[PDB]
Structures are given as C-alpha cells and as structure tokens.
Amino acid sequence: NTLVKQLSSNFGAISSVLNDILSRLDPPEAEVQIDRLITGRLQSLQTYVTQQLIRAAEIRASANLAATKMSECVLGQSKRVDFCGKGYHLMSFPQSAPHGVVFLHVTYVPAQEKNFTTAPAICHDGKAHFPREGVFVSNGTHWFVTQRNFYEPQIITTDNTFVSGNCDVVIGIVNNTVYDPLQPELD
Amino acid sequence: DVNCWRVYSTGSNVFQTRAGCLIGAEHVNNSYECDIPIGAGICASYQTSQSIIAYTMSLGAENSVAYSNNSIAIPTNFTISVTTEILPVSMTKTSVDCTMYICGDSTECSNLLLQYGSFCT
Amino acid sequence: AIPTNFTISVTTEILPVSMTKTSVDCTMYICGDSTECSNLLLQYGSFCTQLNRALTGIAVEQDKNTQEVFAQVKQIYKTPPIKDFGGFNFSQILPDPSKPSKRSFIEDLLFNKVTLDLICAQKFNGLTVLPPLLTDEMIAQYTSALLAGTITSGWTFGAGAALQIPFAMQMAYRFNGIGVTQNVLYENQKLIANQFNSAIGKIQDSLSSTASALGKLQDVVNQNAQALNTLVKQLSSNFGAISSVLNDILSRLDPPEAEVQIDRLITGRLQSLQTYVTQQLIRAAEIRASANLAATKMSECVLGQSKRVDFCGKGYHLMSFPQSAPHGVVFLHVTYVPAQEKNFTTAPAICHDGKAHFPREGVFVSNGTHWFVTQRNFYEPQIITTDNTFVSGNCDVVIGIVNNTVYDPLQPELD
Ligand SMILES: *[C@@H]1O[C@H](CO)[C@@H](O[C@@H]2O[C@H](CO)[C@@H](O)[C@H](O)[C@H]2NC(C)=O)[C@H](O)[C@H]1NC(C)=O
Ligand SMILES: *[C@@H]1O[C@H](CO)[C@@H](O[C@@H]2O[C@H](CO)[C@@H](O)[C@H](O)[C@H]2NC(C)=O)[C@H](O)[C@H]1NC(C)=O
Ligand SMILES: *[C@@H]1O[C@H](CO)[C@@H](O[C@@H]2O[C@H](CO)[C@@H](O)[C@H](O)[C@H]2NC(C)=O)[C@H](O)[C@H]1NC(C)=O
Ligand SMILES: *[C@@H]1O[C@H](CO)[C@@H](O[C@@H]2O[C@H](CO)[C@@H](O)[C@H](O)[C@H]2NC(C)=O)[C@H](O)[C@H]1NC(C)=O
Ligand SMILES: *[C@@H]1O[C@H](CO)[C@@H](O[C@@H]2O[C@H](CO)[C@@H](O)[C@H](O)[C@H]2NC(C)=O)[C@H](O)[C@H]1NC(C)=O
Ligand SMILES: *[C@@H]1O[C@H](CO)[C@@H](O[C@@H]2O[C@H](CO)[C@@H](O)[C@H](O)[C@H]2NC(C)=O)[C@H](O)[C@H]1NC(C)=O
Ligand SMILES: *[C@@H]1O[C@H](CO)[C@@H](O[C@@H]2O[C@H](CO)[C@@H](O)[C@H](O)[C@H]2NC(C)=O)[C@H](O)[C@H]1NC(C)=O
Ligand SMILES: *[C@@H]1O[C@H](CO)[C@@H](O[C@@H]2O[C@H](CO)[C@@H](O)[C@H](O)[C@H]2NC(C)=O)[C@H](O)[C@H]1NC(C)=O
Ligand SMILES: *[C@@H]1O[C@H](CO)[C@@H](O)[C@H](O)[C@H]1NC(C)=O
Ligand SMILES: *[C@@H]1O[C@H](CO)[C@@H](O)[C@H](O)[C@H]1NC(C)=O
Ligand SMILES: *[C@@H]1O[C@H](CO)[C@@H](O)[C@H](O)[C@H]1NC(C)=O
Ligand SMILES: *[C@@H]1O[C@H](CO)[C@@H](O)[C@H](O)[C@H]1NC(C)=O
Ligand SMILES: *[C@@H]1O[C@H](CO)[C@@H](O)[C@H](O)[C@H]1NC(C)=O
C-alpha cells in the first residue's frame, strides 16, 4: 500500500501525473520534470526491495526452525528440554494453517507428590548396597526402593542392588537388612 | 523526557516515572503481571469507578522449596497435556515492473530511464 | 586405554542478548525548528513514516529478546537459609544479602568490566535513548531464581513442579547420565568438592585480572556508539549547498533562491538517515540470532543435562549456572574430564565351554595374567561371572576370542 502511495507525490516537480506533465510541456523543459519523477520513484522502489530482502531472511529462519521441529519432534521422540513443549515429550502431531504450520505436542507431567526420607546406600554385613536403577525411600519404619519418576515401592533384595566397598566411606549410609531371595528355597 | 514545569497543561494524579512524566494514571502499591508496558519496570492497565492504574510489574509468586539433606519428593500421579505451537513457513510471492510502475504507458519516460544502466534488472 | 582419575572443569561463555533502543525524528534532524524546510520535506510522501516505524520495530524486538532469554520460570524460588550442600560452596554466585543491589560477586565483577558531553550533543538533534523494560534489579532476580532452582530441585522444576532432593544425590543422578556408576561419586565426594570450589576460585581471578573476555560483549556497544557518532557528524556537510547550517541560508537568501539550497540539504540528510536505518535493521538480525541461541542454551544446558557434544562446554556436561552481564548473559559450565589413563590388552569375547560370553555393559581388560571386566569411562576391575555376561553362539565366528574361565557364582553355595 505504501508503495502505491508513492505514486501520489510531487518529488519537487510541478505535478505528480506523468501524462499531465507530458501533455502541457514541450520536451526541453519536460525532461527535467520527468527526471525528478523518475529518481523519486526509483528511490521509492529500492526501499521496498531492500525491506523485502531483509524480511525474507527472518521467514527463512522460521522455516528452518519449523523443518527441524518436524524432523525431530514428529518423526521421533526428542530428549531436548523445552524444545517440543513443556514437560517430558511423548509425541506430536502436525497441522497446516494458511502460510504456516501448527504443532500439537503431547507431554507427560507429574501431578501429585509426597515427602520421603532418603538414603544413599545400605550397609548390610559390612558391605554397602547401591540401587541398580532407582532410589531408596522410607515411610517411617521400613525402607523400600522405587523408580525416580513414579512411586512404586518394592522390597530390597540382592537381585536389585549392587555392592561396592564397605560402609565406612559413604556419608549417609544407614543400617538395614537385604532379602537375598534365595535362602528360603534351598530349605 | 520531562521533569514533573515543562508540561503545557496538567491535572490531577500526576505520577513521576524513570521513563518520564505520566498524566491520567493513578499510582498504587499493588503489583500484577504487565498489561501495557510503560517502561523501566513500570506497567499500566485498565481496571475497577473504572480507571487506569500504573504499577511496578511483578515477576511471579515466591516460594521456598522444603530443602533438607535427607528429604526427597516422589510423584504418585501423572497428567497428559496437549499444547499448540504456531510457526510461519512462507509469505506471499509478489513481482513488480519498473516500465509499468515508474513510467507506465509513456514512451519518452523510458528513454530517460535507460540512462540508468542496470538498476531495474 | 582406560582412564583412572577425573577432573572437574568450570568454563565461561559470554553471549549478547540485546542492544540499546534509540529513536530519531526527521522534523528535528533534517529541518530542526524551521518551517520552510518542513514544507519542502512534505513533498516526499512517506519516507519518514517508514523510517520511524523500523526503529520502533527494532525497539519492541529488543525488549522481547530479554523476555525470551531470562523469563523461563513462573515461580521466584528462594534458597533455604541453611547452606548444607554436601561440601559444595556456592557463596561466590549466590546473591549478596548485604549490598543494596542484590547481585552476586561475580555479577559485580562482570558489571565493572564493561564501560557503557557526547550524549547531550546526540540528544540535542532529536536522538533519544529509550529505557529498557526490565531493569537490572529484575534480571538479577530472574537469574537468582534460576540458580536457586537447580541446586535444590534438579531438572524437575523445568518440567512441572519443583521437587526437592539432596545435592549429593543429584550429583550422582548426573554421573549416571554420562556413563559412570553411582559409587564413584559417593566414595570420592569430598575430593570432588575440593575440586569444584577450586575451579570457581579460578573464574573470578580470571575476570578480575587484565584479560579481554567481555570484548565480544563490548563490540556491540562500540558499533552502536560509532553509528550514532557518524550520524551526528553527517550534519556538518555542504552536500553542494552554499552553507551547511540552515538558519544562515534562511537568513541571507530570499525564498526563490533558498528553496534549491534547502532541497539539496534535505536530500543529503535524507540519504544520511536512510543509511543508518538500513544498518540498524541489518544488525538487529544478528542480535536476534544470538538471543535465540542464548535462550536455547538456557533451556537445555541449565534446565537439564545435555548430551550434545561441545554444546554446553568441552567435556562431559554435568550442569550449568547463569549470570547476568550488561546487555548479555554468561554461562558457567561444569564438565567432567578423564585425567590419567593406562594401557591394557582387550578382547571382544570369552570362550568358556564352547560358548562365547559378551560383556553386559563394560569391556574386558587384562593386567598381563588375569582378565577382568570394567566400565568404559572409569577403571574398576571386577571378577568375570555369569551374572555379568551373556551368551550367544559358539566361539568359532568371533575374530579375537580367547580362552578363559567364568566364575558362575552359584556352585560353591549348593555344596
Ligand atoms: C509403612 O509400610 C509398611 C509396609 O507396607 C507398613 O507395615 C504394614 O502395615 C499394615 C497396616 O497395619 C500391616 O497390616 C502390615 O502387617 C504391616 N507390614 C509389616 C511388614 O509390618 C507400615 O504400617 C507403614 N507405615 C506407615 C507409617 O504408613
Ligand atoms: C550398623 O550396625 C552395626 C552393628 O550391627 C554398627 O556397628 C557398631 O555400631 C556401634 C554404635 O555405633 C559401635 O559402638 C560399634 O563399635 C560398631 N561395631 C560393632 C558392634 O562391631 C554400625 O555402626 C551401624 N551403622 C550405622 C550406625 O550407621
Ligand atoms: C525536577 O525539578 C525540580 C525543581 O527544579 C528539582 O527539585 C530541585 O532539586 C534541586 C537539586 O538539589 C534542589 O536544590 C531544589 O531545592 C529542588 N527544588 C524543588 C522545588 O524540589 C528536581 O530535582 C528535578 N528532578 C530531577 C530528577 O532532577
Ligand atoms: C490420579 O488422577 C486421576 C485423575 O486426575 C484420578 O482419577 C479420578 O478419580 C476420581 C475419583 O477417584 C474420579 O471422580 C475422576 O473422574 C477420575 N479422573 C478421571 C480422569 O477419570 C485418580 O484417582 C488418581 N489416582 C490416585 C492414586 O490418586
Ligand atoms: C586423583 O587426582 C587427585 C587430584 O588430582 C589426587 O589427589 C591428590 O593427592 C595428592 C597426594 O596423594 C595430594 O597432595 C593432593 O592434594 C590431592 N589433590 C586434591 C585436590 O586433594 C588423587 O590422589 C588421584 N588419585 C589417584 C588414584 O591417583
Ligand atoms: C565458601 O566460600 C566463601 C568465600 O570465599 C568463604 O568465606 C571466606 O572465609 C574465609 C575464612 O576461611 C574468610 O577469610 C573470607 O573473608 C571469606 N570470604 C567471604 C567472601 O566471606 C567460606 O568460608 C567458604 N565456605 C563456606 C562453608 O561457606
Ligand atoms: C594382576 O592382578 C592380579 C589380581 O589382583 C594379581 O594377582 C595377585 O597378586 C598379588 C600380589 O602378589 C597376590 O598377593 C595375589 O595373591 C594375586 N592374586 C591371584 C589370584 O593370583 C597380579 O599380580 C597382577 N599382575 C600384575 C602384573 O600386576
Ligand atoms: C580354547 O581351549 C580349547 C580347548 O580347551 C581349544 O580347543 C583346542 O585347541 C587346540 C589348539 O588350538 C586344538 O589342537 C584342538 O583341536 C582344539 N579342540 C579340542 C582340544 O577339542 C581352543 O582352540 C582354545 N581357544 C583358542 C586357542 O582360541
Ligand atoms: C514436605 O514437607 C514440607 C516441610 O513441612 C512441607 O512444606 C511440604 O508441604 C511437604 N510436602 C507435601 C507434598 O505436603
Ligand atoms: C543432615 O543434617 C543433620 C543436621 O541437621 C546432620 O545431623 C546429619 O548428619 C546430616 N546427614 C547427612 C546425610 O548429610
Ligand atoms: C503505598 O504504601 C506506602 C507505604 O506502605 C504509603 O505511604 C502510601 O500511601 C501507599 N500508597 C497509597 C496510594 O496510599
Ligand atoms: C601405551 O603404550 C604406548 C606404546 O609404547 C606408549 O607410547 C604409551 O605411553 C602407553 N601409555 C601410557 C599411559 O604410558
Ligand atoms: C592383531 O594383529 C596381529 C598381527 O600383528 C595378528 O597376529 C592378530 O591375530 C590380530 N588380532 C586381532 C584380534 O585382530
């Protein structure tokens, strides 16, 4: 729109209509007026061309980001944080909008939480047991081992922990017992 | 860029900001999320009689996690959330022509425009 | 070759996020207080409307860059009064409770090393510098909340509701992310602390010394000052007219002969303004790209543990801490680096009784006479058993399989 408005400008000439200038002026004095009009319109066109060239770079950067999101969020499961939504990414759906794309991200969010007393390791018989994959917790009287991102208490056994060293160098190790789920069967 | 004087016409409720002089807004001590950014940590909004208020925008609710050296928090329930994200990919394709724009149907204009070598190319 | 010792290294990374916001005015720049100049300037349709629109767009984008970078937490967390982090000492980056401006010591060192009448002369020609939306007292609060969230809740606060956890246990959760077992940390915890603090001690002594690290953050200020100085200097040019000052021309010339001189001055100053506008429009894109990169680094390096190589520092990434510098951000990356290595002879598998045993997770090594199984990124020899390897096929198709025996830790107990 602004470009079109630049046709309604004198730029120093007698009038802004080229046919008007050519109709009532002979060539020798019409040439300078026409030259003024030409240089004004040439500048008005160059400004628009430069603005479009600058805007195309931003559009290209956004298109590249959208292509990356389609490649990674949609065609796989991403582990980058806050890239494919808020939370833990599960999957995504693409949708099309006029001159653009819309991503529907499905995410997993923990809702309710509870306090527990934790411990790094367990000393059984002068040996320190560490969780294979999980964390030790306690409801006040007994100790359980559970996964990090969800609550699922389990009995501490030897097929679930691993030993390393003696209970002298760990900072917050505590007394407890370990099941060793093979003694009763042999009897 | 006015100290509040340099104001032509003033009125009631003149409030001084680091960004300048504000007339027509009532100052309060409350703090809400920014609605209209005045600047320099000052925001303005329209609320309830009805008036326009200016305040120092806040950042969010403040809490302290119950941190202890032998205490942990474990979740027990989960929630599935679906969110949307919009992204532009392309714009409209336009083309312009000098000979129709700068000169139109005229002929004497083209001869003068030819003196500029390769601008329109 | 297997490493036997490790080292904690803390490095710094500077990133510009935003620049200064400025606005210019044609009516004051090209013509000043004159009126006959404005009447002639009206013959150019809308050259000034777009020139004043582009600068407004840049100014409104500059306040969005910072909002994208820092504003990523909905709750302003606070560190607990009791500082019990298992030996790690964060007092060099935690906010000072004494000085009126609640900024940590390293933030003060960063602020003192950047040098932000020249200003009055620029302002007298219709050039103004708008104030930013977020003052430093709010950016400091944002970084303090970000830093107090990671040391008391881990990565959990970036994906929902913050859940507290002892620091010495998340420092093991993070070791499991790079391929080292838990018991390495718990048996070396003190040493690791005595390393980490020392690394912090070498950061400030590198910022308080005669070094040029914030120069990448100072070139931004230098370019913006240089452009304004050149724009102001462009007013002292003839451009072909008799005089370079407009009041003199209006004083000693009648309108019919003054109009052409005024037109020459107007076109010269119009070109001088358009060049500056184009340069600023080009520079804003680079600033925007840097701001996006900084926002990505904050999202991934800080609010989680990254596995991309050479993204959050050199080495194996453990954690990061943010700090605020004038018109930019500084990241302190903590990384794990193996230190002392030793040679060993390796083998793909072990043939026991016509069966080939492969390591469940690890590698076979030997000290010359016996064979052990150890983790890849640290040296910890163990006895080869059946609860530690898995069988597949017979020892005929593997290239470099060797004779050995496997414990099978169940025979002696049955006796
Ligand atoms: C902690 O968990 C243990 C195990 O679930 C609880 O002990 C059980 O409590 C129920 C309720 O009376 C009894 O019927 C079971 O016999 C108990 N089991 C054992 C092995 O003693 C214990 O009550 C829980 N403590 C708290 C405070 O909730
Ligand atoms: C775990 O239990 C053992 C014994 O079953 C504790 O070892 C004894 O602890 C007492 C009290 O601290 C000392 O007086 C003894 O000298 C220890 N050794 C013995 C009896 O041989 C061990 O301290 C417990 N672990 C803890 C408390 O963390
Ligand atoms: C705005 O103007 C007022 C009036 O000139 C300034 O107030 C004066 O400040 C000087 C500085 O020491 C004092 O000596 C005068 O006694 C003050 N006069 C009054 C009436 O207050 C004020 O400082 C100016 N604002 C700023 C930001 O400088
Ligand atoms: C976990 O959350 C879900 C929903 O947030 C709970 O399911 C709701 O249970 C109540 C009563 O038990 C019903 O009135 C709702 O309609 C249920 N929601 C849905 C979506 O069906 C569920 O009980 C929670 N689990 C625990 C252990 O608290
Ligand atoms: C692993 O490296 C650390 C430090 O790089 C070693 O600890 C040093 O030990 C010497 C003598 O034993 C002391 O003088 C130093 O003060 C220790 N460093 C620190 C930071 O306390 C450690 O001995 C190395 N481990 C092995 C097995 O070689
Ligand atoms: C953590 O680091 C701070 C900062 O260096 C230590 O505070 C210093 O303590 C020494 C005493 O050994 C004083 O001479 C310094 O003046 C203190 N510096 C500051 C800035 O207060 C602190 O001791 C370290 N340890 C702990 C547990 O906080
Ligand atoms: C390779 O490791 C084995 C196992 O640690 C070493 O064998 C032990 O050597 C010590 C030192 O004399 C003896 O006290 C043990 O009785 C040996 N154990 C067995 C099972 O024989 C062996 O010496 C090491 N070889 C080298 C070259 O370091
Ligand atoms: C592992 O040991 C077995 C026997 O315990 C080897 O099998 C014999 O190897 C010898 C020497 O190469 C041959 O002469 C025999 O014909 C093999 N078979 C038998 C004795 O039944 C086996 O080669 C060893 N693995 C190696 C060397 O990689
Ligand atoms: C855990 O204990 C703290 C300390 O009193 C308390 O503020 C918090 O509410 C507790 N957690 C839950 C889920 O109630
Ligand atoms: C936790 O802190 C208490 C002091 O409040 C101390 O008695 C205890 O030993 C500490 N335990 C660990 C594992 O840090
Ligand atoms: C805001 O609070 C201050 C001190 O708490 C008080 O002096 C002032 O009057 C309050 N604002 C208004 C509008 O009353
Ligand atoms: C491993 O052996 C090579 C070959 O001689 C030697 O150059 C290298 O120094 C050895 N490794 C170490 C840690 O000494
Ligand atoms: C390694 O190379 C040597 C030759 O130097 C060869 O005798 C041996 O069989 C090779 N072993 C493997 C496992 O490639």
Tab-separated table of N, CA and C and ligand atoms in Angstrom, chain C residues 83 87-92 105 197 204, ligand 6:
chain	number	residue	atom	x	y	z
C	83	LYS	N	22.829	-23.539	54.579
C	83	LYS	CA	23.657	-23.906	53.431
C	83	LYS	C	24.337	-25.235	53.745
C	87	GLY	N	29.260	-30.159	50.883
C	87	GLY	CA	30.631	-29.743	50.668
C	87	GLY	C	30.821	-28.736	49.559
C	88	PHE	N	29.872	-28.619	48.637
C	88	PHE	CA	29.965	-27.631	47.573
C	88	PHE	C	29.635	-26.247	48.116
C	89	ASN	N	30.403	-25.254	47.680
C	89	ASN	CA	30.325	-23.892	48.204
C	89	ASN	C	29.870	-22.969	47.076
C	90	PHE	N	28.602	-22.571	47.124
C	90	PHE	CA	28.008	-21.718	46.104
C	90	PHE	C	27.965	-20.249	46.505
C	91	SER	N	28.655	-19.864	47.579
C	91	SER	CA	28.579	-18.492	48.068
C	91	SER	C	29.167	-17.478	47.099
C	92	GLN	N	29.917	-17.919	46.089
C	92	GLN	CA	30.508	-16.981	45.143
C	92	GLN	C	29.557	-16.608	44.013
C	105	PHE	N	28.815	-11.685	43.651
C	105	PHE	CA	30.143	-11.098	43.495
C	105	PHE	C	30.615	-11.174	42.046
C	197	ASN	N	35.070	-26.208	44.093
C	197	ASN	CA	35.340	-24.897	44.673
C	197	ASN	C	36.576	-24.271	44.049
C	204	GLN	N	36.764	-16.051	38.996
C	204	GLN	CA	36.837	-14.636	39.342
C	204	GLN	C	38.246	-14.086	39.166
D	6	LIG	C1	32.802	-20.604	50.947
D	6	LIG	O1	33.414	-19.516	50.250
D	6	LIG	C2	33.446	-18.290	50.996
D	6	LIG	C3	34.040	-17.244	50.082
D	6	LIG	O2	35.445	-17.407	49.953
D	6	LIG	C4	34.247	-18.483	52.282
D	6	LIG	O3	34.199	-17.285	53.049
D	6	LIG	C5	35.543	-16.861	53.351
D	6	LIG	O4	36.013	-17.435	54.579
D	6	LIG	C6	37.357	-17.060	54.916
D	6	LIG	C7	37.717	-17.816	56.174
D	6	LIG	O5	38.444	-19.001	55.876
D	6	LIG	C8	37.449	-15.546	55.083
D	6	LIG	O6	38.801	-15.183	55.340
D	6	LIG	C9	36.952	-14.845	53.826
D	6	LIG	O7	36.920	-13.438	54.033
D	6	LIG	C10	35.555	-15.337	53.460
D	6	LIG	N1	35.104	-14.722	52.223
D	6	LIG	C11	33.899	-14.158	52.085
D	6	LIG	C12	33.598	-13.570	50.739
D	6	LIG	O8	33.088	-14.125	53.006
D	6	LIG	C13	33.674	-19.638	53.092
D	6	LIG	O9	34.498	-19.899	54.222
D	6	LIG	C14	33.581	-20.894	52.230
D	6	LIG	N2	32.997	-21.999	52.979
D	6	LIG	C15	31.759	-21.997	53.489
D	6	LIG	C16	31.356	-23.239	54.227
D	6	LIG	O10	30.996	-21.043	53.365
